[PDB]
Amino acid sequence: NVVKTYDLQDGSKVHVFKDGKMGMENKFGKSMNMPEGKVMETRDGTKIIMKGNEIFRLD
Amino acid sequence: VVKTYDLQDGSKVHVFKMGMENKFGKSMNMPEGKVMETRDGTKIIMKGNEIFRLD
Ligand SMILES: [Cu+2]
Ligand SMILES: [Cu+2]
Ligand SMILES: [Cu+]
Numbered sequence: 254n255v256v257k258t259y260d261l262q263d264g265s266k267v268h269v270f271k272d273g274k275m276g277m278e279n280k281f282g283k284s285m286n287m288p289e290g291k292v293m294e295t296r297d298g299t300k301i302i303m304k305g306n307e308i309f310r311l312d
Numbered sequence: 313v314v315k316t317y318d319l320q321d322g323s324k325v326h327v328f329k330m331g332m333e334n335k336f337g338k339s340m341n342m343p344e345g346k347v348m349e350t351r352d353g354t355k356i357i358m359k360g361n362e363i364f365r366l367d
Contacts, residue, residue: 290345290359292359292360292362300362300364301364301367302357302359302364304345304347304357305347307355307366307367308366308367309347309355309356309357309364309365309366309367310364310365310366310367311362311363311364311365312356312362312363312364312365
């Protein structure tokens with residue numbers, strides 16, 4: 254049910270699900286609370302930020 | 313002006329430096345951390361003087 258996963262530099266992951274929803278886990282894979290309005294760097298060199306329960310990606 | 317986002321509320325975002333313009337053409341600061349909808353049916357938000365676009 255995961256359509257996409259952002260692999261973040263600090264070891265955490267954000268899963269985007271088929272249902273529209275979004276989940277985050279730390280480097281150990283335990284669930285995290287998702288920050289809002291906080292820029293997060295991916296391992297493939299992009300930046301994302303979460304807001305209003307949506308993901309925005311650097312332009 | 314290198315890039316222009318046309319917004320729903322009638323205003324514009326320019327990247328030249330970055331700034332906004334109301335419907336009347338009056339320039340204004342670029343609102344940080346605030347989501348905005350483009351006439352082309354996408355959403356943007358700016359942070360630390362960078363534009364992020366709905367993924
Ligand atoms: Cu997982
Ligand atoms: Cu202009
Ligand atoms: Cu999130």
